[PDB]
């Protein structure tokens, strides 16, 4: 047979991202002496819509401490901020919405967003619209903390990872039901070439391990092992259980 549609997505020919009209990479300010021993003042200039995601981005303009220049940072717009307000990033920053203070200096039960996995990566966890991570507990002995990622998994990260307080804007976006296939067409036309998903049973055995047969049955257990080769690993990969639940 030939290669399945899933194998062709790794080549990156027509399945690359559509990043022409995107406004940049949303990431926190790189950690420097100002964010380690104090705080830096920044002004929110504009809240723009990034084509491809459901969460707005804020263009916060800080002041460079070593040269006469004003840096522009493209943050994740936490729900509640507005243009013209001041955002303070650093250790000594107060516990307000929008500020970027390390998780080690936050009380237990804080709602953060754009959390950092490791110190310096400029914000990875809890970055989609309406999502957040809660700080569960601290540990001054091992300099570690425990946060609750939006997937429900409790991850143990360092106490120096910075995060934006407050939930991400654009919450409740998945509540409005898409009514037309055209709204789903324009939804993915800005993300990537992945929308029309042809079922494996609707294909021939050459293109998919589920195709073929005078009926449209699967014919084999859809639950597939994890060590299955690329080309066979379709359906339910390493399914611990199935059913309605």
């Amino acid at each position: 047979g030939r290669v399945i549609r899933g194998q062709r997505k790794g080549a990156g020919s027509v399945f690359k991202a559509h990043v022409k009209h995107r406004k940049g990479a949303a990431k926190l300010r790189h950690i420097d002496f100002a964010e380690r021993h104090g705080y830096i003042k920044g002004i929110v200039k504009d809240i723009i819509h990034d084509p491809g995601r459901g969460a707005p981005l804020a263009k916060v303009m800080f002041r460079d401490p070593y040269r006469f220049k004003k840096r522009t940072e493209l943050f994740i717009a936490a729900e509640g901020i507005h243009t013209g307000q001041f955002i303070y990033c650093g250790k000594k920053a107060q516990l307000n919405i929008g500020n970027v203070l390390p998780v080690g200096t936050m009380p237990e039960g804080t709602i953060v967003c754009c959390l950092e996995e490791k110190p310096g990566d400029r914000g990875k966890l809890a970055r989609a619209s309406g999502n957040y991570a809660t700080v569960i507990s601290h540990n001054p002995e091992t300099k570690k903390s425990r946060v609750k990622l939006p997937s429900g998994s409790k991850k143990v990260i360092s106490s120096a990872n910075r995060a934006v307080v407050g939930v991400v804007a654009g919450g409740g976006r998945i509540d409005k039901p898409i009514l037309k296939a055209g709204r789903a067409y324009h939804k993915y036309k800005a993300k990537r070439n992945c929308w029309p998903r042809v079922r494996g049973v609707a294909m021939n055995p050459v293109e998919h391990p589920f195709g073929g047969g005078n009926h449209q049955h699967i014919g084999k257990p859809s639950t597939i092992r994890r060590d299955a080769p690329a080309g066979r690993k379709v359906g339910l990969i390493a399914a611990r259980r199935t059913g309605r639940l």
């Binding site: 809240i47 707005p56 619209s129 509540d175």
Partner: protein, 91 residues
């Protein structure tokens, strides 16, 4: 005055998409297009510009709020929770 008994704004979809689906989009298309009172000027001109973006036509204040409403119910409870955690952090 009233030209539609039940549909209202979703009458633009006709007989398509079903009854229960058109009932759920109605409560959202109303709050999505409605103009809210600007908390910085008092003028009811806070209309939604993009997904999660709310702009005012008088003071030009852009606020990052909910997708279909001005402020989601989750963000209101968080803002009051952060204000409570901040007070106990100092004292």
């Amino acid at each position: 005055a009233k030209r539609t008994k039940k549909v209202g704004i979703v009458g633009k979809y006709g007989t398509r998409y079903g009854a229960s689906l058109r009932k759920m989009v109605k409560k959202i298309e109303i709050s999505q297009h409605a103009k809210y009172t600007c908390s910085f000027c008092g003028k009811t001109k806070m209309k939604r510009k993009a997904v999660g973006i709310w702009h005012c036509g008088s003071c030009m204040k852009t606020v990052a709020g909910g997708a279909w409403s001005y402020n989601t119910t989750s963000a209101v409870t968080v803002k009051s929770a952060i204000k409570r955690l901040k007070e106990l952090k100092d004292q």
